[PDB]
Amino acid sequence: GTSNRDWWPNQLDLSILHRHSSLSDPMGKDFNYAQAFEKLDLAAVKRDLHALMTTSQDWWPADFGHYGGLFIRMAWHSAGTYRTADGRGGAGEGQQRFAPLNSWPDNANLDKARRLLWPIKQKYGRAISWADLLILTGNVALESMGFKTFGFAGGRADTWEPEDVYWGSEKIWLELSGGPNSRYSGDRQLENPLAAVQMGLIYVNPEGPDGNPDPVAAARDIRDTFARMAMNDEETVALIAGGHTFGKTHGAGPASNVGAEPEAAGIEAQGLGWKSAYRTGKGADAITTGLEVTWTTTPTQWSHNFFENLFGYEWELTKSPAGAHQWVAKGADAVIPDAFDPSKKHRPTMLTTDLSLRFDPAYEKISRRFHENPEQFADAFARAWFKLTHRDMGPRARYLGPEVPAEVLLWQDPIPAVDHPLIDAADAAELKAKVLASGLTVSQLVSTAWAAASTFRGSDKRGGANGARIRLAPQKDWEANQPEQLAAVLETLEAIRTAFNGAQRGGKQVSLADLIVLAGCAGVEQAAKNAGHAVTVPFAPGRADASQEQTDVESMAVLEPVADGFRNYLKGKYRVPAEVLLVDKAQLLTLSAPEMTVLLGGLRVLGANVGQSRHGVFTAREQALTNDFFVNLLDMGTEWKPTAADADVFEGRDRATGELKWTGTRVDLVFGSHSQLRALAEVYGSADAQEKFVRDFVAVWNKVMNLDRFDLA
């Protein structure tokens, strides 16, 4: 069946904005997962999971009689697809169960793990999402084996179709670097936003870089990919050594025995894959990765044996029965149990990537400290495991259930509790009138509030106007935020706030986070008034102001807009066309194509462009909220040509006279080009559309303002 994608392989793909519709969702449109989960008897689930750990099923027998290792790996992989660059991946939408992740080579035999959990899923039904269950199971595994976890938050709602995520351009699973679609360039620089070394891996190749078993060089990849997953050196050592305290790898025989991944398997496989022809195909004969390593003498019990072994022995290179590189302790005693035969024991073994923890000089110092103080190791691993598995859950307000940790962590971008009465409608109207009487312009108010709100991304639910972090490092200095204009606006707002708060009785006051938003609302209302329309922009109070001390500046770097088509901003020159970046941004903002279209056309005429650029400002009444962008964009009286100076900027001239009327960017003109966006533009560009445009603008504006307001959910 030949498709639009086959005929026009570089056209824009808008379907990414329209996933997750009510059509694909089996739950009623009123279904509220948070309220279902809040009534789940979580202790009862955890008792069932505890039982599970040691109830071996013959179709996938439990190593050492205990599924703990397998489930820890399953949870780790669920969380481990996470990239800080865009917030995509991670455990928070249960995407391990869909394509492609369910069939990634690094996820081999995690299909068995997920299937082991069906009876418990089935028992508790909609009160526990798969997403939450995968993470909970990991926790229970650790707990069953003697490890005290830091806590657990429910709240990850299930999703019903695969996400659209750029995982790389390679066309071959696990392709080595330096191919026609290499994710590496220069001096082993991994392309953003990727966070793994090969297509279908979680982070790194366990044999070493492109299969070279050099622990020192492997450590370089570990550090890079873990950093791209938001983990520093301490966290990375804790997580790796923590996880490889348990279980084993599977490599009983040659890898050519293993069949098709789940999405390529036959229908009879019922969603399972990697069927193995090697001996029994499971248990003692299992092949997953091809490595054959068991790290510890008690693979079902928390211990400090990983570091005891790592440091206690000297290691020699060897080959698994599948031929993969791995390490064995030279002439150790055979002290490591066999997973199925109680009369066999084995020597200590390690992956090349495990040895990285000892032979990378930075890791070695941390690893030694963990070896000599295994309580520090346990506390670090607990914290890191919580961070791993919760990193894409968003604000602490989404955390559910009785095991949520009380401690507030820096990585959570915490927002202080509000302890005082909030402003009401009359107060909001008085502030709005003050903001407008200060002489702040429509353009300044809208740009500031846009800049504050639009850092939100739905992928990991980081960002947004809550916190007033726009006033702090690093946001206040991002080029897209126009630091000098921003500083002037914030100064005037802060004076209005101080005066307002000083006049109150009874503890009422307004946060600057709220006022920035409210001022943006005044701006949009004044714009509408300039166009002759009386509208009220909805506003919900209750944002609070975070301090610089509660704001990790390095972690905030990834939220910087380098492309914001909504402000006609591109920080530099990229290989990805600007219109593609626009749609990506709209996806992170959770906008549909209609919402993206309305919003952009309104922002243009409000003066939200960075640097007061006239590109796409197709109106002779700037700062009035009108549909002029659309009417003028669609006017066939104008002819567009790319400029000689820049192929990415266009001049619009009167077709009859040649007179220069406007200039625009690819982001502006895509709305007159792409056949689906033009259809949208046409609706807003019609003579009956003025009222619709304003109402839809205000709605989407409001929506953007509220993206991070999970305190109100």
Added chain:
Amino acid sequence: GTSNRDWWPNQLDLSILHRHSSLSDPMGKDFNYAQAFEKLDLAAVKRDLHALMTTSQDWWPADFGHYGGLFIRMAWHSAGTYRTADGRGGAGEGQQRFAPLNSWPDNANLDKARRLLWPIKQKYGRAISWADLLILTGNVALESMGFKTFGFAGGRADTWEPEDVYWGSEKIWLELSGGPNSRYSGDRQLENPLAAVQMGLIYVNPEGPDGNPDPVAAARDIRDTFARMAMNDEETVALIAGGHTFGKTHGAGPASNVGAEPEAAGIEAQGLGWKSAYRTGKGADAITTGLEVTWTTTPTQWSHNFFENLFGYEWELTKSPAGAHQWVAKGADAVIPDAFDPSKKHRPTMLTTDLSLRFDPAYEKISRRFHENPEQFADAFARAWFKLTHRDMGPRARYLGPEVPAEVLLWQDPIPAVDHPLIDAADAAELKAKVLASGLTVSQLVSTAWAAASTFRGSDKRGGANGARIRLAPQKDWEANQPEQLAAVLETLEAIRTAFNGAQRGGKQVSLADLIVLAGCAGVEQAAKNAGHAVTVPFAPGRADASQEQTDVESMAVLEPVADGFRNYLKGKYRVPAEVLLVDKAQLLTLSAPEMTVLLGGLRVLGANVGQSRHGVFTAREQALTNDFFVNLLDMGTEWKPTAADADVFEGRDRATGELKWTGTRVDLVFGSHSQLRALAEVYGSADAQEKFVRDFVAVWNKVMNLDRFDLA
């Protein structure tokens, strides 16, 4: 970006069921196009369109000073993608403005036509859809040029993204037959459901089959493609000769002058394509197809000159300035006007496909009759043009506005008006009790109502339970409908009906159409009662019984289910896998993936399978409405394997004992295999889901029952 479609190119694609969501739609959820159109001043639009016909724009100058020909071609093409095999294509969704149809070679320069309409679109806004405007503009063109149309109906709502239609497998535009993805096999047999000879054509190649200019062989393709678009010989001659009474083709210079189609063109082209490097690139220099033919001496006025010329001259093969085969009149004077230069005239010319109307012996007779009786020609063309442009509109109840023809036509599958009081809720309860007392089983009732309702397709809005056509030829005889069982059920229902109707006062009666449906509802209520659930199934009366004379039996043939996964039925062995045919069917029924899942799992346990097959009947309480399908399908205690007799049937055996528990087909097992369908199955298979299952089943049931009930909109 490598996608799931690249990795697993033969997986099922469920996104086709979830297009056309609220997310992609710029109109509010409450927007009702019918009500907007009913307030449009249609007369005023038509005045504006009249004005347009002779308002020539410099960017695409009107031939002969009149755009009529162009707009007739535009409207023809809009309607001309229609296939009777699935009802997909046609004018009714305005899909000509989206990919791929906006960029089909046969639609070249229709982008200009559509752009000329923007001011009118813009003026009237949401009150007239593009879909309607394209056909209206065709009508006005004809009327402006002196042809009186049969009438016009509004009501085609706009759509907002491209449909997912199989247009063929070729990877090259216009590829000739016999390639690696040939749409032809055997003795020039065109593959169903296709209705064009080459990828990117409407029907046939104007130079002749695969470009060989044999009018007789061309006539074969014409007949086959037009038949696949629901037109017989009389209609086809009328339409072709009718249409080529107007306008001209465009072929002023070599085709290598013509640039990128709209979807490939630059952003600066603002949605237009085929920019030509030949001389001025437009007007007198225009290149569209490459042919250069002008059929009549008055290309802007209705005449009888097409047949005068066709029969009046003998024809010699020649070449256009682009090199295409075409025909010129032997010995003729230069009597055809030039489109731009009043001092030039040309000899009469014809396409190979025009000469088909004279050299095909069957077309010749029709053509001669039209020649000698031009009133018969005019009336046939009027009727055919109305049919062409309204064929996919569905029931007459959907027809809006003041130009709707009063005459009821056979091809509309008309439904007689209801002239008597309808049964009310007390009568419906009485009939249900009678149906249940008669001894008809749950399985009989559900199968019959399913068979009646499930002929509906949303593509052209044909089919459905309205009419009681299940009791007529050919439906009563379809294998999928189990003719023998059907005849017994209809006999018992007809007796219940006669008794009920005979007992009434005041003209009240119930149609068999309604009773079939109501009986289906009683069967579902009983099934629910068998399972311990107290369920009332919604019923809406008002169907009427159509007569055999109101039911064109040939036309009905295309509605025969050769694949109906909802009754585990496949009429033969096909190249397309059965699960693909299931999803296609669900798409025609307007079902989302959840709806398709719930519906199939319920039908299985209700006994709706053809021949009482046990395949997929995964319950020990058949005829009870339970979620057993799901719970049993997902039970990991069962292992599935294809049978030795048949690779498409599976045996499910107890994994521990080897005991045979169930058998199923690919349609059954796909719900436990495909990762998105399995996620749905899991909701319905959960321990808290029995009530949800029942309620969702009843909802989808009712939806299917009501699919053709446009009298209730």
